[PDB]
Structure formats: C-alpha cells, structure tokens
C-alpha cells in the first residue's frame, strides 16, 4: 500500500497486573502479527515479574516496507509507531514504573522498532532484546539518536545470510548503541533460519533477563 496511516491506540496487557509490578516490558510484534501472538513469548521467556504490554500494529504492520527502504517510503506510519511505543512507555511511567525497570523484546519488524525507538530515547532502561533487527532507514541518520543508555544491556541478533537483515546493519547498529553507551551483546548465528532460535531464548534469559 502506503504509510500514509496511523497506528490508534491499541494496548494488550498481560503479565503482573501494573499497579504490583516491579518490572515492566514492552513486546512488539513482528510484520503481519499480533500482540497476542508475540504476548506468548511469556511461555518461553523469563517476564514472569512483569507488566507486560505489548500494541497492536495498524495493518499489523509497524509501516509498509524493509526497514532499509529510503525512510521517507515508511512515515508517517514510522513516526505514528514511534509515538504509540511511546505512549505506552509514558504510560508504564505514570503506572509508578521508572523507566530502568522497563524492558523491551521484539522479533524482525518489531526488533527494528525496539532499536529505533530506545535509541531515538536512549537513557537506562531495565534491558532491550531486539531478535533479528537493526536501527532503521537506508541512510541511518545519527542525528536522530540521543541520549545515553547508562550501561542498558541489550541483546541484538541476525542469522547469516538473511535477506531481510544484512549482518551490515546489525553490525552498524552495534557501534551507534556501543558509542551511547550501551552494554551491547551480539549474536550472529550463520545458517539460522529467520526465526528465534531456543539458544537465543536460554542467553536472553541468562543475561538480559537474569
Ligand atoms: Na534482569
């Protein structure tokens, strides 16, 4: 289609209900999927003492192509899906959750969406888990990127070969969350089909998430 569409303000809650919780985690869904469907990642992942929240794409798409498309091909869809994941962080925040207890986790669409969000926000954060993503446009703008991460881990991997994700890209998005101070972990798993692997699930929970 296009990106001229907005994502409304639809927000699936899981997990410790928010006014108990000590942690909270922002899960995005990858391209043609549901908040359901990524809210299932719980049976796997160590969230068990999060809120969890996880927004509904319009279209069930975060916006319409590659991530490495020329960016203005993506917006407004782009910037209306950076605005509802920052709706939902405002909203964790006003819950009484400071944002070093909020946690991020997305797969593919919704890996490219975690990045670019934390990193146009950078500032410590509980843990980023980005399965199968990379910071997004054709050109990155470092110009978009502020703030510091005060040592926020994050976990951040690619199969090889993968169409959809050039090694390229997550190595690039390596060195921008590096230079803001991120405590970065890459994974590069080569012959990995475009997925999560169960290695991924175990290191995540026994780091990002320990
Ligand atoms: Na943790």
Same mark, same amino acid.
């Given at each position: 289609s296009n990106a001229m569409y907005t994502h409304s303000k639809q927000i699936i809650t899981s997990g410790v209900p928010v006014q108990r919780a000590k942690k909270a985690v922002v899960m995005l869904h990858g391209r043609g999927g549901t908040a359901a469907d990524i809210i299932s990642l719980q049976k796997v992942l160590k969230l068990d003492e999060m809120a969890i929240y996880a927004p509904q794409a319009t +279209? +069930?798409?975060? %916006? @319409? %192509?590659?991530?490495?498309? @020329?960016?203005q091909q993506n917006q407004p869809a782009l910037d209306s899906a950076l605005a509802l994941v920052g709706e939902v962080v405002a909203e964790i925040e006003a819950q009484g959750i400071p944002a070093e207890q909020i946690y991020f986790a997305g797969f593919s669409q919704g890996a490219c969406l975690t990045l670019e969000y934390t990193t146009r +926000?950078?500032?410590? %954060?509980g843990g980023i888990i980005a399965f199968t993503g990379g910071l997004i446009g054709?050109?990155?703008?470092?110009? +978009?990127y502020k703030g510091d991460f005060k040592q926020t881990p994050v976990f951040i991997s690619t199969g090889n070969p993968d169409p959809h994700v050039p090694v390229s890209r997550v190595q690039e998005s390596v060195t921008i969350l590096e230079d803001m101070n991120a405590a970065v972990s890459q994974v590069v798993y080569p012959g990995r089909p475009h997925t999560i692997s169960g290695d991924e699930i175990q290191l995540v929970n026994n780091t990002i998430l320990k």
């Open positions: +279209n +069930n798409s975060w %916006y @319409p %192509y590659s991530f490495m498309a @020329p960016v +926000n950078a500032r410590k %954060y054709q050109e990155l703008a470092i110009g +978009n």
